[PDB]
């Protein structure tokens, strides 16, 4: 695999791909 | 956090695995 530059919705897509059925938490900074 | 690192910097798919349930 390679390193990633992921902003906005592109990060959510990557989390979905990586975690799939396990699910994930998307937890930005306040 | 990761949301910030992946955008301002770069991150790996392996680092993302840390956010799976
Ligand atoms: Zn875009």
UniProtKB/Swiss-Prot annotation, chain A:
This is Insulin B chain. It comes from Bos taurus. The chain holds residues 25 to 54 of 105 of the full protein.
């Amino acid at each position: 695999f390679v390193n990633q530059h992921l902003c906005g919705s592109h990060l959510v897509e990557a989390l979905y791909l990586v975690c799939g059925e396990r699910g994930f938490f998307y937890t930005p900074k306040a | 956090g990761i949301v910030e690192q992946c955008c301002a910097s770069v991150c790996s798919l392996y680092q993302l695995e840390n956010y799976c349930n």
